[PDB]
From a paper:
This construct (CtRea1-MIDAS) carries a ~105 residue-long N-terminal extension, which is absent from integrin MIDAS domains but is known to contribute to Ytm1 and Rsa4 binding both in yeast and human. The first half of the Rea1-specific N-terminal extension contains a long α-helix (element I), which wraps around the MIDAS domain core. Although this part of the N-terminal extension (amino acids 4693–4732) has a low-sequence conservation, it contains an invariant tryptophan residue in the first part of the helix (W4710 in C. thermophilum and W4633 in S. cerevisiae), which packs between helices α3 and α4 and most likely anchors the N-terminal helix in place. Rigid body fitting of the CtRea1-MIDAS into the density map of S. pombe Rea1 unambiguously identified the Rea1-MIDAS loop attached to the Rea1-AAA+ inner pore ring.
The conserved interaction between the C-terminal Rea1-MIDAS and the Rsa4-UBL (ubiquitin-like domain) or Ytm1-UBL is essential for assembly of the 60S pre-ribosome in a reaction mediated by the Rea1 ATPase upon ATP hydrolysis that leads to the removal of Ytm1 and Rsa4 from distinct pre-60S intermediates. In this study, we report crystal structures of the Chaetomium thermophilum (Ct) Rea1-MIDAS, both alone and in complex with its pre-ribosomal substrates, the CtYtm1- or CtRsa4-UBL domains.
Residue numbers in the entry: 4693 to 4743, 4753 to 4886, 4891 to 4935, 4942 to 5000
Write the structure that this text describes.
């Protein structure tokens, strides 16, 4: 907490960032939210049992189908997503890497998609040497521009190291805290989405294993998104829409084990987050297991 007295970004600047990223990602946020709504909607087909054709008059009103929808998505299941963003200087790289910005832009895309969807809670954590909650799961969803500015303010990408072990334990802790709350008024699905740049040497994989093992016993699912790009001003201009990758086939196949999605091109970052989220929502939702 004492290390947290870093200076924040200028509010006007963070406000303009949020607004710019929202405009740049709105198409993808809207598409993704319509895909997640479809995934959560009961859509199982009818089934055959046992063993002139009658042609009944089958009619309904579109009005009535919107009413069925208002009751259709069950509130017994909630989704909790912690989006964890590397707050170290490796993300800034003296403006050379540009990864920090693309990561915040992806955060905006996800936050807007979950808000429009009106299902799930979003939380945001930053991590480097310390770990801070930039936006708690119990905070109001990102409908207001102030709430978006305030999250982006907290990310300046100047911590000097990345301590993945600490991030994992706090993430586990925060999810445990969240499970206790719902035990006293509720099926709860929890996902940590961890974005960072650089390399992973397997010296890194191994020391994460006990915590990841602990997370799995607590049904927490963990996905690492690893950015490693080897220009900057047209990223500024870039507009994001659907890129044609609905799911991560390999992650679907490994569910619910921890997964590393390696993203070599930063303009794929928002696409890759969208695809991971669709995959996860599809998996936690299927009656499987």
């Amino acid at each position: 907490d004492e290390q947290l007295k870093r200076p924040l970004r200028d509010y006007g600047e963070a406000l303009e960032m949020w607004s710019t990223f929202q405009t740049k990602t709105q198409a993808l946020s809207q598409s993704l939210s319509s895909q997640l709504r479809l995934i959560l909607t009961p859509t199982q087909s009818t089934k055959l049992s046992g063993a002139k054709k009658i042609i009944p008059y089958i009619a309904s009103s579109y009005k009535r189908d919107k009413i069925w929808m208002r009751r259709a998505i069950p509130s017994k299941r909630a989704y909790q997503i912690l989006l964890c963003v590397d707050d170290s200087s490796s993300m800034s790289d003296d403006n050379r890497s540009t990864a920090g910005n693309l990561a915040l832009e992806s955060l905006v895309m996800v936050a807007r998609a979950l808000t429009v969807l009106e299902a799930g809670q979003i939380g945001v954590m930053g991590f480097g040497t310390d770990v801070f909650v930039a936006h708690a799961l119990t905070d109001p969803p990102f409908t207001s521009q102030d709430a978006g500015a305030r999250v982006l303010q907290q990310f300046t990408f100047r911590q000097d190291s990345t301590d993945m072990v600490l991030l994992l334990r706090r993430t586990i802790d925060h999810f445990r805290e969240a499970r206790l709350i719902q035990a006293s008024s509720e099926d709860l699905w929890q996902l940590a989405l961890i974005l960072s740049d650089g390399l992973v040497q397997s010296r890194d994989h191994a020391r994460l294993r006990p915590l990841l093992r602990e997370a799995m016993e607590q049904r927490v699912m963990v996905v690492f998104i690893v950015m490693d790009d080897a220009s900057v001003l047209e990223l500024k201009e870039a507009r994001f829409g659907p890129d044609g990758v609905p799911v991560i086939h390999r992650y679907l196949d490994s569910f619910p084990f921890p997964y590393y999605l390696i993203v070599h091109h930063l303009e794929d970052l928002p696409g890759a987050l969208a695809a991971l989220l669709r995959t996860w929502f599809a998996e936690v939702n299927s009656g499987s297991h």
